[PDB]
């Protein structure tokens, strides 16, 4: 279902930037000092709607970095092809391992 998230305020946040998280300013996982990493993990909710929101925000960050600029290249499409081929190899891990060339390795 399509609607802006409830934290979005068009009279405060300006135009809608879907890659931006409009909620309360939580510490990003990059700069967490790892002594509070369990507290950071417990602070973020594990709801499937929040997970799909974080996936969509990340996918829009990638769109904003590699596709949405005007003179974008074919680097995003090669990234998708390689990312899909690696993921589909990890899915078929057994189907490729069961046809190895060497025994011991």
């Amino acid at each position: 279902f399509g609607d802006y998230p409830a934290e979005y305020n068009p009279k405060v946040h300006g135009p809608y930037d879907p890659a931006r998280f409009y909620g309360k300013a939580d510490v990003p996982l990059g700069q967490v000092k790892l002594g509070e990493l369990s507290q950071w993990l417990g602070r973020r909710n594990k709801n499937p709607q929040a997970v799909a929101a974080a996936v969509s925000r990340g996918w829009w960050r990638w769109q904003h970095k590699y596709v949405l600029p005007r003179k974008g290249g074919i680097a995003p499409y090669i990234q998708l092809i390689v990312g899909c081929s690696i993921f589909f190899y990890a899915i078929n891990y057994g189907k490729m391992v069961a046809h190895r060339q060497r025994k011991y390795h």
Binding site: P18, L68, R70, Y77, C84, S85, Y89, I91, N92, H99
Partner: protein
């Protein structure tokens, strides 16, 4: 194991995720002036929409987008499926049958319900003799009946043969002998250019045939 490309029973996360691939490769529009891939995708879609509007007619308002979405679905599964470890959904006869049968039913049943006597006059191709008229009726019935089989087979069997011919060349590509490897890679470059062209041609064939069946 040769046919191991066509084994969707892969892991707990199965190979049916090959149908969510077109959601990744569809252009998302944010800015008012489009980017290069959005403009290129829209230009190709507008070109095919203009080509199909000639065959559609004015009484087919829904056929502008219903065949374009089918073209992009078939094209993305045929094109991004040829990359190595990616599962090809349209290789299986189930997906192509799932695309061809419902729209063919939506043509045949709606034509019979809407215009019955016009369809019965349309069975005779305007000039054939009356002794050959029941034969032409049987020919028209059979030719309409094997319409969705000849779409699903022409897509699935072509994709299966197109990837089995690559797998046969890959299995003979030994790594110890560099000469055989270079021959295999060069022949697979020729074969993969042929397979990419066949993939786009077969998606355009399906769009053209669905447009012709929608209009007629």
């Amino acid at each position: 194991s040769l046919f191991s490309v066509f084994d969707p029973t892969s892991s707990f996360l199965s190979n049916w995720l090959s149908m969510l691939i077109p959601l990744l490769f569809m252009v998302m529009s944010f800015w008012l002036i489009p980017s290069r891939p959005q403009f290129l995708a829209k230009s190709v879609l507008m070109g095919l929409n203009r080509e199909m509007s000639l065959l559609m007619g004015p009484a087919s308002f829904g056929a502008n987008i219903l065949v374009i979405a089918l073209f992009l679905f078939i094209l993305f599964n045929n094109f991004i499926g040829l990359f190595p470890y990616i599962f090809t959904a349209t290789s299986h006869l189930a997906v192509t049958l799932s695309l061809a049968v419902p729209l063919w039913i939506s043509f045949i049943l709606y034509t019979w319900i809407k215009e019955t006597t016009n369809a019965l006059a349309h069975l005779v191709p305007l000039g054939t003799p009356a002794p050959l008229m029941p034969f032409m009726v049987l020919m028209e019935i059979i030719s309409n009946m094997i319409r969705p089989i000849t779409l699903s087979v022409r897509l699935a069997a072509n994709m299966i043969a197109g990837h089995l011919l690559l797998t046969l060349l890959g299995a003979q590509g030994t790594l110890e002998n560099l000469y055989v490897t270079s021959i295999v890679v060069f022949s697979q470059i020729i074969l993969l250019m042929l397979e990419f062209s066949v993939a786009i041609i077969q998606s355009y064939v399906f769009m053209t045939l669905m447009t012709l069946y929608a209009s007629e």
